[PDB]
Design a protein around this ligand. Structure first.
Ligand SMILES: NC(=O)c1cc[n+](CCC[n+]2ccc(/C=N/O)cc2)cc1
Ligand SMILES: NC(=O)c1cc[n+](CCC[n+]2ccc(/C=N/O)cc2)cc1
Ligand SMILES: *[C@@H]1O[C@H](CO)[C@@H](O)[C@H](O)[C@H]1NC(C)=O
Ligand SMILES: *[C@@H]1O[C@H](CO)[C@@H](O)[C@H](O)[C@H]1NC(C)=O
Ligand SMILES: [Br-]
Ligand SMILES: [Br-]
Lengths: 533, 535
């Protein structure tokens, strides 16, 4: 019985496990319950605090993955499988994970809380790319990650109902944040220094905690990687939520109360089976059950809230990868495949645009095409392909990020911005996809430090740089190394200079304007164009 | 005759002419100035198509420029050389339909390829007697036969009650055509080759050239065309029949005037009275818009220029087209608040938005926002210098560069051989401020070889540059190809094509080839904008 592995939290006693990181041991506490299992009558309901337990709870292994769709597009393919559930699926899934240095930190240590992505329909804190041992070992970080309900289980909403209020997945995350507040000190973590970081849907989730009053007291800093609360995919109106919920109910044979009761009787996989069929249009980068503007968790739309928010007390790190859009193209755009070079025709490009910008009117889609066309080579299939990617990436991540950055900086927040441009030597996707959505994560989490992974040593050095930025940000709200003079320095993003940095094997380079001209098209003109249909 | 210079007596269809021996820097040229090609379009003939000049008795003296067609005179910067060079340099009169011929001296032995100049001036001004249109240099140095005609401008040349007999419209264009026919009948008498006629013009002159291309009855009158900073298509060169009718009736009202009766009243008004009111009939506050221009009459122009260039066949045709670096700057000082020739014209974002409404007068609010959004530098949205240069570009792109790009494209795609250029040399002698760069109209003096005149103060490099340009122009007149047949040691000028969209830079440095004429931005003006307005 290793005293270093025994912790007492408010709920009782836990036993962690000692894991080996390339440079030493870490204490891991996996599968810690933070809520009553949201099963049965609890389905679709706000989470409830875990009841206390007797004896010593085994916290040495990952718990179940929240019930979710499993990707089938390229069965057995490492590129897609790495995101799939690596534990048994279950609605009983509200557990979190904690890594600390071994032994337990001598003093209160800054906490990082990871919130995974997956379009709000998938994901798990137990994935390898979210392995927290490296950050704990090398940086001395206390690292927390929670499972939260996805798909219908987490976000199906009949706005105004008592039995399906919506946003319960976000409430899962918030409850976990509270748990950290009440318990993290027992692990040597500092409740007064908590940094949320997340990617994609996880980034959007972080964004929503920023925009929700009750979450404010639960964290001090935020990192949003490749995702925002604002933008086309992260939220839906009460009306659209109600619409999708009713439709899904109809699709499985089911007055709110009676409708939700009937839904509570269906095997989990029935709901998952019809989940994806409620989308209003043929689209990509669009998800069926996501946070809903309920006037509760979100008092108004994200755009409204970031436009009028006061972000004085806040530091934020935001950024994107070089090719945000590529990944999504193979999941709906004719002409695109991970197997060929996906060279496309102008006709396919126009077709692609209606799918990538599913809300676009004809004139808006034409506006897009004309903007993204290279009029020197309007038919070159290589640019047409890369343009299709750019359209999707810009529309969904880059410009929503540029907007958020601007609004936050303009309204009191300390903001740092990056673009991530290194393509993993070990990437299994085709070259034409470049640096795809999600492939900075393995570097931030420090995986290349594991020799058995076969990254280059430049990459191992690169990962070390990134873990430094992230953890320095967590410690101080400033990613800059306090010992390193000459680098150059990572400047804050401001509406004036609009500076951000490139993250790659070369040293920090400062650039100005985050796709400034094109995002202006998306952020300023496009809305006017659609408001006049 | 008898004691006169035997080399200066020539007969044309209308009678005998006595020309004059002029001194060019490298020797004498023959000039025949103020030759009548039509009956004076005066009195009951005002607004009417031109009638051929009735033959005269004796020897018509052709030693001086004739009247300038009645027109408005610019008054923005009184006395300033930058504006005065364009102003009338002979008496204003409705009796103004005369043309000029320069030829080598003595005249050419074999048939010589002919260049016909058509001046610009927004269809409300201009004259073939201006110093910058002096044909002595092209005649002397290139041995060219050069012809320029006066044509009626403003109301006298373009007021139309479409469908009427007494004011059919486009008569200014008919003046031009009549002169082209005169060249066909008579130019051989000077040693000119009627079977090798090349039209060239700038601004409204270029658009005029463009319209002869688009008008069937003109087909047989020329073989090749140069369009400098102007096009038949675009926002300013034509008006609908409806808009012309609207403008004519409004002008009539402003001077106290059934088509027949209205026109009859207009014919009793002093010419000056029409000039004093012509500028008042424009639909909006604007720049680069002119009250009385060619109308789409379903006759001279069987359809809109846009339609005609889209569906036309242009095989047996070579065309040279191009623009200057700063097409728009000149126009800013004539109506965009914040702009002047006397300061740097650094403007605020607000003045930029206001300028866009003026420079794009037909734009709805959304289309204007589109323009502003496109031209804004979102790294420096409030920067006065960028906004000033952006305002120039908006005007330049909308009115010249993109209509030209549009035209070159259609022409090329449809049989024409097209060469394209951008002219980037700012004259050492320019009197406008540096911020205006290379303004609309300021390549002309080089094409005509004025820098060869020692007393003009051009640099030696400018002299040499002018010689190159005269070569390009005359080579194209001769062969439909600006390239020198011999000198292949000098860089070549590729034709413009839809595929490669190549054009050359014209400056003190040797020809340099470039690709795409504001392709990205012109896609906005040519493809997107139309669709945004119709919605
Ligand atoms: N039910 C849904 O909303 C739903 C919508 C769309 N899809 C297709 C997901 C296709 N996809 C998988 C992974 C990624 C990103 N990886 O980093 C991007 C896209 C699956 C489910
Ligand atoms: N009546 C009219 O149409 C009319 C319209 C506009 N203006 C002002 C013209 C002001 N302007 C003069 C010369 C040039 C180009 N020079 O190369 C550019 C602009 C005068 C008359
Ligand atoms: C330049 O002159 C114009 C015309 O008077 C004026 O509108 C503008 O404000 C001036 N620009 C300055 C003073 O910077
Ligand atoms: C050329 O320069 C000389 C010397 O300054 C001057 O006297 C003359 O007036 C100038 N000529 C012209 C036409 O500008
Ligand atoms: Br998707
Ligand atoms: Br004007």
């Amino acid at each position: 019985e290793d005293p270093q592995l025994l912790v007492r939290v408010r709920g009782g006693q836990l036993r962690g496990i000692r894991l080996k990181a390339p440079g030493g041991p870490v204490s891991a506490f996996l599968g810690i319950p933070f809520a009553e299992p949201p099963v049965g009558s609890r389905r679709f309901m706000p989470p409830e605090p875990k009841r206390p337990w007797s004896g010593v709870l085994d916290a040495t292994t990952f718990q179940n993955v929240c019930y979710q769709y499993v990707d089938t597009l390229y069965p057995g393919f490492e590129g897609t499988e790495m995101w799939n559930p690596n534990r048994e699926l279950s609605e009983d899934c509200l557990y979190l994970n904690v890594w600390t240095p071994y032994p337990r930190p001598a003093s209160p240590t800054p906490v990082l809380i990871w919130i995974y992505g997956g379009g709000f329909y998938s994901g798990a804190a137990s994935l390898d790319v979210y392995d927290g041992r490296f950050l704990a070992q090398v940086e001395g970080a206390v690292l927390v990650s929670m499972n939260y309900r996805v798909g219908t289980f987490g976000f199906l909403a009949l706005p105004g109902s008592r039995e399906a209020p919506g946003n319960v997945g976000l409430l899962d995350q918030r409850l976990a944040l509270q748990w950290v507040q009440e318990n993290i000190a027992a692990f040597g973590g500092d409740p007064m220094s908590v940094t949320l970081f997340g990617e994609s849907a996880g980034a959007a989730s972080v964004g929503m905690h920023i925009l929700s009053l009750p979450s404010r007291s639960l964290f001090h800093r935020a990192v949003l990687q490749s995702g925002t609360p604002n933008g086309p995919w992260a939220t839906v109106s009460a009306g659209e939520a109600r619409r999708r919920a009713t439709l899904l109910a109809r699709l499985v044979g089911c007055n709110d109360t009676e409708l939700i009761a009937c839904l509570r009787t269906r095997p989990a996989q029935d709901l998952v089976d019809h989940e994806w069929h409620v989308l209003p249009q043929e689209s990509i980068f669009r998800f069926s059950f996501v946070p809903v503007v309920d006037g509760d968790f979100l008092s108004d739309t994200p755009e409204a809230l970031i436009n009028t928010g006061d972000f004085q007390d806040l530091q934020v790190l935001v950024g994107v990868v070089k090719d945000e859009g590529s990944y999504f193209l193979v999941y709906g755009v004719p002409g695109f495949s991970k197997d060929n070079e996906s060279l496309i025709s102008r006709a396919q490009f126009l077709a692609g645009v209606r799918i990538g910008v599913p809300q676009a009117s004809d004139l808006a889609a034409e506006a897009v095409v004309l903007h993204y066309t290279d009029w020197l080579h309007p038919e070159d299939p290589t640019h047409l392909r890369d343009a299709m990617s750019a359209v999707v990436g810009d529309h969904n991540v880059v410009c929503p990020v540029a907007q958020l950055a601007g609004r936050l900086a303009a309204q009191g927040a300390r903001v740092y911005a990056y673009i991530f441009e290194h393509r993993a030597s070990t990437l299994t996707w085709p070259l034409w996809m470049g640096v795809p959505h999600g492939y900075e994560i393995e570097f931030i989490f420090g995986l290349p430090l594991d020799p058995s992974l076969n990254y280059t040593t430049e990459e191992r050095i690169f990962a070390q740089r990134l873990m430094k930025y992230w953890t320095n940000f967590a410690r101080t709200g400033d990613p800059n190394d306090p010992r390193d003079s000459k680098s150059p320095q990572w400047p804050p993003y401001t509406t004036a200079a609009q500076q951000y940095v490139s993250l790659n094997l070369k040293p920090l380079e400062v650039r100005r304007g985050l796709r400034a001209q094109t995002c202006a098209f998306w952020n300023r003109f496009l809305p006017k164009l659609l408001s006049a249909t």
